[PDB]
């Protein structure tokens, strides 16, 4: 269930509400300002990392479950999304349907959205691909 949630359901949840559109109209306080803007942010693919931990001083190192248990840390992995930004502009005049066009300003784009805790021996944990003697090397029970 955790492998299904990480590998497939995370992507579906991101792609459900990926598009987010804010609309600004002409602000017809003067005749020079008749431009309508449309800003759309779209969340693309989601990437889940290996488990890690950031320290007080910003130092991030890969976290292993024995070290996580001893230091009272959280065995979690960061989640990134490829966000794409789109800005559209149009001439806002009455009696004409608005036609928005791209301004060719599309920056791309992993951004941190949160630490998802990782169930041990999932498809994401370190102990999954560990062999036997490797697993005693990490001070874990086989």
């Amino acid at each position: 269930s955790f492998n299904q949630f990480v590998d497939y359901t995370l992507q579906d949840i991101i792609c459900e509400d990926s598009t987010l559109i804010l609309e600004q109209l002409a602000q017809h306080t003067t005749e020079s300002d008749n431009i309508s803007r449309k800003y759309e942010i779209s969340f693309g693919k989601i990437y889940v990392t290996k488990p890690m931990v950031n320290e007080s001083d910003g130092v991030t190192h890969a976290l292993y479950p024995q070290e996580a248990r001893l230091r009272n840390l959280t065995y979690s992995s960061g989640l990134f999304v490829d966000v794409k930004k789109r800005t559209y502009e149009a001439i806002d005049v009455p009696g004409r349907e608005l036609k928005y066009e791209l301004i060719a300003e599309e920056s791309e784009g992993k951004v941190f959205i949160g630490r998802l805790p990782i169930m041990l021996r999932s498809k994401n944990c370190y102990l999954s691909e560990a062999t036997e003697s490797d697993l005693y090397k990490l001070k874990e029970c086989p």
């Binding site: 559109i21 804010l22 609309e23 600004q24 109209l25 602000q27 017809h28 449309k38």
Partner: peptide
Amino acid sequence: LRRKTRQLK
């Protein structure tokens, strides 16, 4: 008297 920002579903 306008609404400035608005939500587009």
